[PDB]
Each structure stands twice: as structure tokens, then as C-alpha cells.
């Protein structure tokens, strides 16, 4: 041992308990827990013909016609 070269401890030993002000005290997922496939499997998940949202007014089960109005 080279006793004399050892640095001061000013920024080593201090505060291993620090907060989240720009960055975390432990990271998740850096061990990669699944390999990312980047796919959802469409029509296996979700529906073969789409969500029906937007323009909700009761539907008419009786025939209606673009030319039929005057």
C-alpha cells in the first residue's frame, strides 16, 4: 500500500442516499427482462374490424339516402 496517494474523501463517501431531483436512486429494466419484439399481434389482440367511436347519434335500421333529401 501506497498510503500517501489516497485522495480526499469529500465527493466519494458522501450521500449515497440522494433524491430524484434530476435522476433515480435505483433504475428499472436495465437488466432486460423481456427482449422487445416491437409488435402487438394485430387482430389477435384488438378487433378484426375497428372501434366504432366518434359521431354518436342513434343508428337508423331503416333505409336512408343522400339523393332522397330536397
Amino acid at each position: 500500500m501506497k498510503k500517501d496517494i489516497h485522495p480526499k474523501y469529500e465527493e466519494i463517501t458522501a450521500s449515497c442516499s440522494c433524491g430524484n431531483v434530476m435522476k433515480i436512486r435505483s433504475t428499472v429494466g436495465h437488466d432486460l427482462n423481456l427482449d422487445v419484439c416491437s409488435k402487438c399481434h394485430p387482430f389477435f389482440t384488438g378487433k378484426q374490424r375497428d372501434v366504432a367511436t366518434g359521431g354518436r347519434v342513434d343508428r337508423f335500421n331503416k333505409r336512408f339516402n343522400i339523393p332522397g333529401s330536397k
Binding site: 409488435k39 402487438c40 399481434h41 394485430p42 387482430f43 389477435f44 378484426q48 374490424r49 375497428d50 366504432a52
Partner: protein, 91 residues
């Protein structure tokens, strides 16, 4: 991206070969021109021999491939490579 808008697809065209094939689970390659048709859960484990305009290509249908149409796994065009020109079509 593009989609099938709002109405219900199995393909009308493919339906009459498939309903008799699912009854067996899977049977010999279904001679298909219907490259207009998408892949679905009912179709997992079938073998669709898919006309590409020139000839049929067997698509083995399976769960990892349900995000796709049948027409995508069977090629159409030929691409001239550019080291030196492409000699062949590739299946």
C-alpha cells in the same frame, strides 16, 4: 398506416375453402387467388397456397403472422441489385 375501415372481414372469397378446412383443423394447401385477404385467429395452423399472379406460394398461417395479409409473404416484383444485376426471382 392503412386499414379496412369499419365493416367485417373474413374475406367473402376465401370463406368457402376455409369453412371446410377448419372442420379438419388443416388439410392440403387451399388453392387461393384471394391475396386481398387478411390473416385472422380462425386461420391459425392452415396452409394457403397463395397465387401471386404468376404461381401459388404456400403460406403456413400461424399466430406470429396475424398482423399481416397473405399477399405480403408471397412476393410480386423483382429488384435489380447493384453490385451486378439480379439473375433470378426469389422464393
Amino acid at each position: 398506416p392503412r386499414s379496412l375501415k369499419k365493416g367485417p372481414f373474413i374475406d367473402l372469397h376465401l370463406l368457402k375453402k376455409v369453412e371446410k378446412a377448419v372442420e379438419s383443423g388443416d388439410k392440403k394447401p387451399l388453392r387461393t387467388w384471394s391475396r386481398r385477404s387478411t390473416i385472422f385467429p380462425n386461420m391459425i395452423g392452415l396452409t394457403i397456397a397463395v397465387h401471386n399472379g404468376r404461381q401459388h406460394v404456400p403460406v403456413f398461417v400461424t399466430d406470429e403472422m396475424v398482423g399481416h395479409k397473405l399477399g405480403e409473404f408471397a412476393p410480386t416484383r423483382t429488384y435489380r441489385g447493384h453490385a451486378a444485376d439480379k439473375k433470378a426471382k426469389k422464393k
